[PDB]
């Protein structure tokens, strides 16, 4: 199942859904803890973490270091240690059962800060940070290696991206996109890198470009029916999955899905309730 986790409404929101891609089905689970918006999601260990974001309420405007995880056995949520730092407009990937947490914000604050969670210590520990401040950044995980990309430094969108050497514990810059890009949905299809969507300081975006490690190279592929930013994205069964976002008019419920065979997108469901500023990861089925 592609689990939803949080996002946004006018209010951060506490929904946790997931759909499941043959039934059409969307399942109700246990509500997050706290209401979070632009909080990012993964799956380590069959487990759902829901990283950062922030609790927009109508009583109270707060950045969020928490870390909370999903049990699908269970559906039952859990507090884990939090993050050195709010991180709002976080971006997340995972090497070696690892939880990389990237930039983000906390008020004026631009990250280019960059912790690592250990799950069988419940431990962050800070690594060396980015070259550059990024929220609304996009991470994804290739070999092993962690890549942002895009983002905003609090004065300009970017098209810049940077790759992480774990064992080595720094950042390098790498071919920047083709696209400014902040709040674009990005993940790894079977070796590339894709960015898709996000909002470039004048336009939300439908186009989609994926990177080549061998080539070091972004190139252009067909682009979805919907312009988004702050878009959910997963990969499932081989196709990517984008979740909601904003097209400067709408919080979209629209679920678009990308075949990379035939290079095309189509719209597969839509949302209980349009959103923004998902956290999205794929795991096991609630147990029942």
């Known amino acids: 199942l592609i689990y939803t986790a949080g996002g946004y409404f006018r209010q951060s929101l506490s929904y946790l859904e997931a759909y499941n891609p043959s039934d059409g089905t969307w399942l109700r689970l246990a509500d997050l803890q706290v209401p979070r918006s632009g909080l990012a999601g993964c799956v380590v260990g069959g487990l759902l973490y829901a990283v950062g974001g922030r609790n927009n309420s109508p009583d ?15 559906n039952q949520w859990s507090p884990c240690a ?13 090497i070696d059962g ?3 947490a990237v930039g ?4 004026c604050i631009h990250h280019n800060s960059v912790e690592r969670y ?3 210590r419940d431990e962050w520990h800070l690594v060396a940070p980015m070259l550059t401040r990024r929220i609304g950044v996009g991470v994804a995980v290739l070999n092993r290696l962690l890549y942002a990309v895009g983002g905003f430094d609090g004065t300009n969108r970017l098209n810049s991206a ?9 950042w390098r810059m790498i071919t920047a996109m083709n696209t400014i890009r902040s709040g674009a ?14 909002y470039d300081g004048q336009d939300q975006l439908n186009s989609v470009e994926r990177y080549d490690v061998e080539t070091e190279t972004w190139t252009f592929v067909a682009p979805m029916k919907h312009r988004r930013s702050a878009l959910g994205i997963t990969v499932h069964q081989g196709r990517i999955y984008v979740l909601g976002g904003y097209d400067g008019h709408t919080f979209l419920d629209s679920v678009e899905c990308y075949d990379p065979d035939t ?14 500023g998902v956290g999205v990861a794929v795991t096991m089925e609630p147990s029942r």
Not at 60 to 74: E, K, Q, R, V
Not at 162 to 170: D, F, I, Q, S
Not at 263 to 276: A, I, L, N, P
């Open 263 to 276: 290079d095309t997108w189509s719209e597969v469901t839509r949302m209980t309730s349009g959103r923004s």
């Open 162 to 170: 940077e790759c992480y050497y774990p064992e080595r514990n720094e």
């Open 60 to 74: 109270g405007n707060t950045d969020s270091s928490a870390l909370d995880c999903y049990n699908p056995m269970t």
């Open 98 to 100: 690892h939880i990389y």
């Open 82 to 94: 939090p993050m050195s730092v709010p991180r709002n407009r976080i971006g997340v990937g995972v």
């Open 185 to 198: 949905g990005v993940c790894v299809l079977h070796n590339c890198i894709y960015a898709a969507g996000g």
């Open 118 to 120: 250990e799950p069988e």
């Open 104 to 107: 983000g914000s906390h008020g």
